[PDB]
Design an enzyme around this catalytic site. Structure first.
Site, PDB file in Angstrom:
ATOM      1  N   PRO A 162       0.982  -1.546  -0.359  1.00  0.00           N
ATOM      2  CG  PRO A 162       0.224  -1.117   1.909  1.00  0.00           C
ATOM      3  CD  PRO A 162       0.393  -1.612   1.390  1.00  0.00           C
ATOM      4  CD  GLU A 163       3.231   3.812   4.359  1.00  0.00           C
ATOM      5  OE1 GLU A 163       4.189   3.878   5.525  1.00  0.00           O
ATOM      6  OE2 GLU A 163       2.015   4.426   4.551  1.00  0.00           O
TER       7      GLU A 163
END
Ligand SMILES: *[C@@H]1O[C@H](CO)[C@@H](O[C@@H]2O[C@H](CO)[C@@H](O)[C@H](O)[C@H]2NC(C)=O)[C@H](O)[C@H]1NC(C)=O
Ligand code: GAL
Ligand code: GAL
Lengths: 254, 263
Positions: A162-163
């Site tokens: 995600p990051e």
């Protein structure tokens, strides 16, 4: 609820495969009518259907084992994951997800919650220590499917998926490791840039579209831990390379 | 929903040519004092405050366009007496300080110190590049394009091609100036100058002269295009072996995507 999904097979996967895998997980949440200088502003719960709220991610390690995690389409957070008919949800875990998250698998609940401040605690280790890369990702994947799932392991996928789509910087970082089969640990910069996603999110929506200057500043950091306050869009993207914006407010210069 | 809190008056600096910040001549706050270039530093005649009225004023005097036609220099003056349509501004993400009314933008005819500023026709050139921030120091970083390789510079007046990323090497170190010009970190006197405006034109490394072919706007989509035309900086035929980086319309293909990976 047949939730969509973006899969990435570690099985001899190339760097160009990582770039696409992220682009898919990105567009799966980039769908919306709100932009700013290009980067989109993820929708909010107030206007997110229960059939579009989440998105699954199938990460298959070298041994073929595959683990799927649900990423909130609103904040791109990791709410839960499942491996071998075994789903796991955090302490808080809004009952809204469980009701339709991995419906049909033995439910579980961790003693901790989703957030670095907590994760790092329930592992006796900080992100500055946990390594990332091809192998670390494999071992982290195995630790989940095998050992149920503990902080550490999650700390790897979060900054590796995600990051990784939120900040293109982290991408090219895991892109060099994935290709060079090497590993590394988050530096003062990479860490700081991922600790102010919300802050740098309002500084972009506050200044408004096309507006370079920022009303406030973002306390980022260099490799030498030296303070690097970014006060403009360009200077921000050139460093972090943000690609996703967390809704913190709506434009005003309409 | 929730509208955004009306931003308060924030003070920052403005650079946009060879690394020089726009300073108030002599530092006099008197009305009329022209605006020009001058080495950045700790001084009140260099810090500017931004207000909602789109008025940038230093010392307390709004920055107004002395005239109103291509050629009129810039200077400060009492915000109350100066014309309204001559005190407003707009800092676009293209690094172009435009003036809503006159439609003109702040221009630096020369990077030479003391060069008096003057609103000129907007033609998208490295002379109209301007980045506002308290950090006049340009960014030092590499540029990974295709095949995870880094765009490296060689000698003056020579094409730029992608070579195996070598952080230690200086032939791959770049400095992102505030004037929107990319110059080799080593000799910060050479900018990545294009060779034209027609798609399929080469991109070498020659001296800086506020040229329009030296204007680079890092599109948030990942592409690095020049302001004048929509042409993008990429790798010919997606083949790095050709050792030829050129300008080509945005296709959205990988070989057109870049990334400034810090030092
Ligand atoms: C980019 O190049 C500059 C010089 O063009 C390097 O600056 C160094 O640090 C200061 C500031 O310029 C000066 O003392 C010298 O110019 C340089 N050498 C030393 C020993 O400081 C800068 O380090 C370069 N950036 C990177 C990432 O290497
Ligand atoms: O740009 C002209 C310069 O003139 C000097 O006399 C003054 O000390 C500087 O602050 C600057 O105003
Ligand atoms: O092959 C012809 C062209 O194709 C485009 O898609 C690419 O962006 C250009 O760099 C060039 O390769």
């Amino acid at each position: 609820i047949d939730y969509p999904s973006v899969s990435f097979n570690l099985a001899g996967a190339k760097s160009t495969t990582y770039r696409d895998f992220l682009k898919n997980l990105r567009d799966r949440v980039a769908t919306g009518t709100y932009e700013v200088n290009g980067l989109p502003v993820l929708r909010r719960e107030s206007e997110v259907q229960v059939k579009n709220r989440f998105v699954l991610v199938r990460l298959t390690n070298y041994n073929g084992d595959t683990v799927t995690s649900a990423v909130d389409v609103t904040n791109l957070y990791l709410v839960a994951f499942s491996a071998n008919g075994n789903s796991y949800f955090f302490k808080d875990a809004t009952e809204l997800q469980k009701s339709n998250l991995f419906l049909g698998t033995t439910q579980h609940t961790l003693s901790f919650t989703g957030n670095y401040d907590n994760l790092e605690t329930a592992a006796g280790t900080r992100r500055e220590s946990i390594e990332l890369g091809p192998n670390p990702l494999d071992g982290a994947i195995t630790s989940l499917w095998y050992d149920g799932g503990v902080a550490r392991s999650l700390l790897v996928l979060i900054q590796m998926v995600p990051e990784a789509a939120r900040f293109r910087y982290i991408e090219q970082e895991v892109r060099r490791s994935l290709q060079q089969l090497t590993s590394f640990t988050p530096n003062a910069l990479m860490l700081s840039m991922e600790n102010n996603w919300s802050s740098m999110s309002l500084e972009v929506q506050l200044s408004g579209d096309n507006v370079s200057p920022f009303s406030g500043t973002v306390q980022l950091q260099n490799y030498d831990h030296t303070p690097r306050l970014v006060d403009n869009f360009e200077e921000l993207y050139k460093i972090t390379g943000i690609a996703i914006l967390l809704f913190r407010c709506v434009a005003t210069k309409t | 929903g929730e509208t955004c809190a009306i931003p308060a008056p924030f003070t920052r600096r403005i650079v946009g040519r060879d690394g020089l910040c726009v300073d108030v001549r002599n530092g006099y706050d008197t009305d009329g004092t022209p605006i020009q270039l001058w080495p950045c530093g700790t001084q009140r005649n260099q810090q500017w405050t931004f207000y909602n009225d789109k008025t940038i004023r230093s010392m307390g005097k709004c920055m107004t366009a002395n005239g109103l036609n291509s050629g009129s220099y810039i200077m400060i003056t009492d915000c109350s007496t100066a014309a309204e349509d001559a005190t407003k501004w707009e800092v676009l993400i293209d690094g172009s300080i435009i003036n809503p009314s006159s439609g003109l933008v702040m221009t630096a005819p020369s990077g030479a110190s003391r060069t008096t500023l003057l609103l000129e026709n907007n033609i998208h050139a490295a002379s109209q590049g301007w980045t506002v921030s308290n950090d006049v120091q340009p960014i030092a970083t590499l540029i990974v394009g295709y095949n995870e390789m880094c765009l490296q510079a060689n000698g003056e007046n020579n094409n730029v091609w992608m070579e195996d990323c070598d952080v230690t090497s200086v032939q791959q170190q770049w400095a992102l100036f505030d004037d929107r010009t990319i110059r080799v970190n080593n000799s910060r006197g050479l900018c990545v100058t294009s060779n034209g405006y027609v798609s399929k034109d080469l991109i070498v490394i020659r001296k800086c002269q506020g040229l329009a072919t030296q204007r680079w706007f890092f599109n948030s989509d990942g592409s690095v295009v020049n302001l004048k035309s929509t042409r993008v900086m990429d790798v010919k035929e997606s083949d790095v072996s050709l050792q030829e980086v050129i300008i080509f319309p945005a296709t959205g293909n990988p070989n057109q995507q870049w990334r400034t990976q810090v030092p």
